[PDB]
Design a protein around this ligand. Sequence first.
Ligand SMILES: NC[C@H]1O[C@H](Cc2cc(-c3ccccc3)on2)CC[C@@H]1O
Length: 340
Amino acid sequence: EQESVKEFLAKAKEEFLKKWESPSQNTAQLDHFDRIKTLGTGSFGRVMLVKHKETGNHYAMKILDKQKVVKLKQIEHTLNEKRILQAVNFPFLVKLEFSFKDNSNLYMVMEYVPGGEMFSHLRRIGRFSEPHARFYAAQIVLTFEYLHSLDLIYRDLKPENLLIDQQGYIQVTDFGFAKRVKGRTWTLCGTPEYLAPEIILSKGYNKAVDWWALGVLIYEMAAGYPPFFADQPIQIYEKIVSGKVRFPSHFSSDLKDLLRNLLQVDLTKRFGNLKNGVNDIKNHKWFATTDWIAIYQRKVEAPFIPKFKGPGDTSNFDDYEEEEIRVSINEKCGKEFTEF
Ligand SMILES: NC[C@H]1O[C@H](Cc2cc(-c3ccccc3)on2)CC[C@@H]1O
């Protein structure tokens, strides 16, 4: 590896560790913002477009209900998410701008990316050409090189978590399953189509699960559907552990070769997890046309610029029932979230 790359990652780790050891806390409050629209909603949290009342800036505010986080056994995961997000800094990671908590909720105020989810664009176009998929894949390779060098595993790679920004570049969002891991970890988490075999088999697993998920993502970007698709999770899991995959004839030979090495059931043989680490991926023939430095510096023209009218446009996100942000008169779960 070139010394310029080693010195970049060494500085990246130094800066991450300083924030990791002394996390920021309580840097805004709810009534500093106007609520605009719900952008997404789930079991214990929502994401809302908000506007800062003084600056007029738009943000995506992730709101987690503390009581529901506790009930769904996500305490450690939510503390991971905020502690990691306030400590990282990389061009293709959505930036955390503020965080705070109140009697009822936890709040993470993120930069708003109006272009929408890759998922929507992929489903609307059908599939991406290999150059298009390769542009996005290269950004994920660099992002995982950065995260893994900090001993972080991401564990939620899927098209819904990749937002497309105003320049057509990727911004990775949702660190709900990200974790600082030296060695192995054991939690069952992730969306079924993207789970590595060693997760399904309840093994102690490591950062190699992110490289497996990259193989699933590249396949899905280039085919339009994921490689182990089936109607129920149990059938998906059987396909994942089987060690076989069917490639569309339109895939290039180089793409198939890369995917066989990322979708390697044996984690000890999987690209990204060998002695040369990420460089087996970066040096693969499928990436021969990729200028890694130019991607990082955002100097490559993107294949596609999302259509939107301005920083407040929500047209690339969906419609959800608009629900209250209620804040109880009494503190809930104060002890569990002391460090948030
Ligand atoms: N001025 C020269 C350039 O050199 C450095 C570029 C760079 C980036 C990375 C990297 C390595 C792994 C993952 C992601 C990125 O390694 N070297 C930094 C500034 C500038 O872009």
